[PDB]
Design a protein around this ligand. Structure first.
Ligand SMILES: Cc1nnc2n1-c1ccccc1C(c1ccccc1)=N[C@H]2NC(=O)OCc1ccccc1
Length: 110
């Protein structure tokens, strides 16, 4: 069961990285580069930063003990985005589009 669900989770992340979703997924590929982006207050507001590459590394290092732990990291990524940015921000619109993809696949896990 657990190995099966983590297998599915790897398939979900792979979909999220796929060219099909690149136009709204790209901001989540890597850790937020606060210095490059000039986000002086990002670490004041966001205590547990998360991104798709860190999630990929954690999967491949077999650091998730079940699918819900993986699920909580993905949702943390998205929540950090919603916490930091105003609701009308361009990056929030992208986050919700990508969360469409995640939530639909995640719910249909065996
Ligand atoms: C993820 C995530 N969470 N927040 C943010 N990203 C993020 C992470 C990585 C990369 C981009 C972003 C974008 C973003 C994404 C898409 C469009 C616009 C902004 N916006 C970032 N937020 C912000 O205020 O950037 C200022 C800004 C605004 C405009 C330009 C430069 C800097």
């Amino acid at each position: 069961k657990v190995s099966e669900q983590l297998k599915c989770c790897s398939g979900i992340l792979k979909e999220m990285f796929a060219k099909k979703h690149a136009a709204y997924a790209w901001p989540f590929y890597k850790p937020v580069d606060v210095e490059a982006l000039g986000l002086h207050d990002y670490c004041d507001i966001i205590k547990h930063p998360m991104d798709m590459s860190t999630i990929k590394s954690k999967l491949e290092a077999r650091e998730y003990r079940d699918a819900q732990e993986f699920g909580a990291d993905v949702r943390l990524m998205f929540s950090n985005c919603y916490k930091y940015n105003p609701p009308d921000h361009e990056v929030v619109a992208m986050a919700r589009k990508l969360q469409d993809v995640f939530e639909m696949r995640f719910a249909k896990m065996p």
